[PDB]
Design a protein around this nucleic acid. Structure first.
Ligand SMILES: [Ca+2]
Lengths: 219, 219
DNA sequence: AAAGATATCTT
DNA sequence: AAAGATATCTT
């Protein structure tokens, strides 16, 4: 199935998971930083081709936001079913150590979940699912080697800013918590658990309605 | 000087190279997106190498933040001058047309500028200069087709999410405005004018004290 | 155009 | 706890 194939395609990365930098059409290459702001974008860009591929294989049309600051990242809907649109958002968090308690921010709770068309590509009601692709990596110190350019003949010499990269696909309500993920940016917080817990689905809400009904009243 | 040497190296690097994607150690490339979220990250990572070199060239030690939410992007100082540090932060904004007015967010005004050690690598009083490197691009088609991955043998093929990228270096206070660039995130807003005005530094503040004084009593 | 989104982290 | 930083945009 779509969902079963996507989660599997993500596991296989593309070629392989070892993104080392941004390349120029001139053939020059630049390293990557360690901060999440950097890997966040990278992961999101890393997922674009994989998604569009699986979606294509399952007769799905993908639509990214036209205007920035709009949710979600990917909208999968079929020509004949302009009623059941799928949403996929890429979330990423870091970890200082290995296999420890992590937590993601799952988007504000004062936007589309409260105003059917606030900050969202398509009207909320037109979506039946909300899949969250979460990425978890272990931070790494940006070595001095990361501050120099490389040529194509050295891709395997470009030091990586991360380590144990783990990915997962899961429904938003299934992995959401009861605590906010941010203050001034009123974000929904997920559960504070281990990577496995997200893959499994050990959450707190026993249904979508419960989730929506909890965060639409969060104060 | 270090400053003119920097801006010149930045002009060069921008004209002699065009970033087009993220490459893997396996030789796999993934196109970029046409949103400020992705580009600001690609521009930041694009500047690091140049900055580090020109720094070492003029006898300067470079230091990046240890925390994802610490300013500035780059800290330079001479070993025999630890209390005369220089702060370089990269900002990015987009345009829809050609010579079109723009405005940047120049960092918050309720942190390190009001609390000497709040959200900043080194104490505020230690920095004797705060430089801003501004990158301006123009949104494009954003693939709308190029959602696939490429290989090293197709660089010239990979489409670009930007059109007219221009960069400039200028003191934060010199291009600073009197209007907030952010609401909840209480960021300082620059002047709203053309690229040229930023280079020529046609700000509204006469000196840096006028700048600080204004944004420290801002509400 | 003040206020509040989009993502995520730190105190 | 929460409250509010990091950067940029939309309304
Ligand atoms: Ca997102």
């Amino acid at each position: 199935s779509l969902r079963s194939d996507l989660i599997n395609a993500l596991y296989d990365e593309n070629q392989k998971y070892d993104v080392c930098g941004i390349i120029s059409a001139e053939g020059k290459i630049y390293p990557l930083g360690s901060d999440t702001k950097v890997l966040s974008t990278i992961f999101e860009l890393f997922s674009r081709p994989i998604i569009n591929k699986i979606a294509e294989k399952h007769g799905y049309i993908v639509e990214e936001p036209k205007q920035q600051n709009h949710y979600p990242d990917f909208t999968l809907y079929k020509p004949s079913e302009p009623n059941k649109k799928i949403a996929i958002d890429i979330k990423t968090t870091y970890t200082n150590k290995e296999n420890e308690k992590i937590k993601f921010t799952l988007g504000g709770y004062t936007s589309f979940i409260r105003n059917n068309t606030k900050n969202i590509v398509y009207p909320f009601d037109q979506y039946i699912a909300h899949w969250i692709i979460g990425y978890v990596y272990t931070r790494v110190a940006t070595r001095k080697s990361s501050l120099k350019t490389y040529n194509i003949n050295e891709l395997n010499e470009i030091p990586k800013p991360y380590k144990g990269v783990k990915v997962f696909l899961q429904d938003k309500w299934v992995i959401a918590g009861d605590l906010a993920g941010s203050g001034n940016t009123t974000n929904i917080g997920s559960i504070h658990a281990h990577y496995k817990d997200f893959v499994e689905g050990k959450g707190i809400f026993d249904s979508e309605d419960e989730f929506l009904d909890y965060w639409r009243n969060y104060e």
